[PDB]
Structure formats: structure tokens, C-alpha cells
Design a binder for this molecule. Structure first.
Ligand SMILES: CCC(=O)Nc1nc(C)cs1
Ligand SMILES: CCC(=O)Nc1nc(C)cs1
Ligand SMILES: CCC(=O)Nc1nc(C)cs1
Length: 282
């Protein structure tokens, strides 16, 4: 079926939970043996969210190459994304090592450091120009260059230096700051505006490594971001845009990381975002 009318048909019939459970039942199951090794317990935020072995990002290190991060490679859309958990106190250096080694331009953050009164990720970037951060375990230096605070999101320019080689690179930090503590946003307008700002920066384009996107677990809000982006790109590429099937695209993405889209409300919000976004594109 088309999307917008499939949408009203699920709303009128109140069957979002049943649609979402079907997706959960059909989703791929691949091994995640490296994630479950005992030496990696303090590298995982949640025991039930792990990268598959076949698609995990490897750190260029011989001691321990593990990080909770997955490469989502979308063949028809010609887009790739790295989806990862919010960094932990003992993985902030690994996180920036990955950004460096994978040649990413942008980092997309969809959570606040504290939500619901608890810490959802480490404070992994510097908040003042004159107070830079050094990660001694991976030999990187990170400096805040500029910050632009808007009503729904903040964009930061960061400098990442590889202290071994003295090479430097500019990284863009796109921080969506207004996702509610509970539920999903009422309108997708600010989320779409944010997606378009990431696109306009070059951070999603083939001349760079894959964008790094995270929330707390790296599957819920993060899944919503890449699912909406890929569906809108396919609608621009194909002769028949009504042939884009959001459930099929989501199941393809779940071949590369488990659990993408965590609730039926997140599924409905993803439909809403793609529907509204397709009208603005034209
Ligand atoms: C330094 C040890 C190590 O894992 N080096 C690697 N280089 C590449 C390119 C992959 S792993
Ligand atoms: C303030 C940092 C910032 O917004 N940098 C951007 N560069 C481009 C190219 C778009 S936004
Ligand atoms: C389970 C998610 C869900 O049913 N959301 C809905 N929101 C409206 C407005 C109708 S159904």
C-alpha cells in the first residue's frame, strides 16, 4: 500500500502495536559473540543491546578492537551510517578513535546528557574553547572551536587532533536538544528541519566517511533518524515514489543492527516524518 493512506488505515483501526510486533518477529537474528566476551562488559551500556559480529565497527588496535557500534550500509540509497550507543566514562577515547579512523565528518546526538534524572551518556566534548580535552588512552586532543545554539538544536565546530601524527580535522557536532523525556514529538517539523541541516553540512555525503549517530542505546531515536533519511532519499531516486515501503526499509536496516525503532510510537512518528518530509522536498 502507499504510505499516507496505510497510515490513516492503521490510525483508524488502532493497530500500531500489532504492526510493530510483526516487525519484531520478522527481524534478523545474527550472532554478537564479541560483544558478550567478559572483557567487554564495561564497554556496553545495556546488556540487551549489542552489535552483530558481521557489521560491527572494529577499532584499529591489537589489544581490544571492540566498540558498541554498527555499520548500516544502504545499497540502493547509496548511504551509510554508523549507529552507536552514547559513550560511557571508559569509552570516550574509543568513540573519538572511531570517528578518526572511519573519516567521519559529522556526529549526530539525539539525547541530552541527563534525562529523567539519570545520566544517559558521558560529557564527551568540551564546553569551553579554552578547556580542551585530551584522551590519553587513544592519543587524541579535542577542542571546541565555535557553538551555535538554536531553539531546537545546537551545532558545534570541533577540532580533532591525532597527537601521534599532528594531523588535524574539523568535526561537526549536530545536537538535537528537544526530544521529550517521554514519548515522541507531537510534530515532526523540528526533527525534519534538523535532518536537513545535517544534510546541508556535507556530513552525510559520499566524499566523507559515514556519519556517527547516537542516542542512549543507539537504536531508538537513532533508528528514526536514519530510517527517515533513507526513505526520503529513495523517494527522490525512484520513478514511482509511492513504491517506497517503510516497513521493508526498516527490516533491511535491522539486518545490520538489532532493535532499530524501540516502540510503536516511534514507528508511527517515523511514518509521520517521511509523509510530511515528502511534501516539502517538492
Ligand atoms: C595497530 C593494530 C591494528 O589493529 N591496526 C589496524 N590497521 C587497520 C587498517 C585495521 S586494524
Ligand atoms: C557553527 C558550526 C557550524 O554550524 N558549521 C557549519 N558548517 C556548515 C558547512 C554548515 S553548518
Ligand atoms: C501506539 C502508538 C499510537 O497508537 N499512537 C497514536 N497517536 C494517535 C494520535 C493515534 S494512535
Amino acid at each position: 500500500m502507499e504510505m499516507e493512506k496505510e497510515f490513516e488505515q492503521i490510525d483508524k483501526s488502532g493497530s500500531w502495536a500489532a504492526i510493530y510486533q510483526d516487525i519484531r518477529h520478522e527481524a534478523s537474528d545474527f550472532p554478537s559473540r564479541v560483544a558478550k566476551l567478559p572483557k567487554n562488559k564495561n564497554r556496553n551500556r545495556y546488556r540487551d543491546v549489542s552489535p552483530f559480529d558481521h557489521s560491527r565497527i572494529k577499532l584499529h588496535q591489537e589489544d581490544n578492537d571492540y566498540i558498541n557500534a554498527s555499520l548500516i550500509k544502504m545499497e540502493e540509497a547509496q548511504r551509510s551510517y554508523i549507529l552507536t550507543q552514547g559513550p560511557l566514562p571508559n569509552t570516550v577515547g574509543h568513540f573519538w578513535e572511531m570517528v578518526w579512523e572511519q573519516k567521519s565528518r559529522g556526529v549526530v546526538m539525539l539525547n541530552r546528557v541527563m534525562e529523567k534524572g539519570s545520566l544517559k551518556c558521558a560529557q564527551y566534548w568540551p564546553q569551553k574553547e579554552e578547556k580542551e580535552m585530551i584522551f590519553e588512552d587513544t592519543n587524541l586532543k579535542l577542542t571546541l572551536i565555535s557553538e551555535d545554539i538554536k531553539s531546537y538544536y545546537t551545532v558545534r565546530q570541533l577540532e580533532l587532533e591525532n597527537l601521534t601524527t599532528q594531523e588535524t580535522r574539523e568535526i561537526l557536532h549536530f545536537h538535537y536538544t528537544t526530544w521529550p523525556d517521554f514519548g515522541v514529538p507531537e510534530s515532526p517539523a523540528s526533527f525534519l528541519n534538523f535532518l536537513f541541516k545535517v544534510r546541508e553540512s556535507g556530513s552525510l555525503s559520499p566524499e566523507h566517511g559515514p556519519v556517527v549517530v547516537h542516542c542512549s542505546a543507539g537504536i531508538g531515536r537513532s533508528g528514526t533518524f536514519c530510517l527517515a533519511d533513507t526513505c526520503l532519499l529513495l523517494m527522490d531516486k525512484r520513478k514511482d515514489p509511492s513504491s517506497v515501503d517503510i516497513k521493508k526499509v526498516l527490516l533491511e536496516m535491522r539486518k545490520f543492527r538489532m532493535g532499530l525503532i524501540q516502540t510503536a510510537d516511534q514507528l508511527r512518528f517515523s511514518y509521520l516524518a517521511v509523509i510530511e518530509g515528502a511534501k516539502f522536498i517538492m
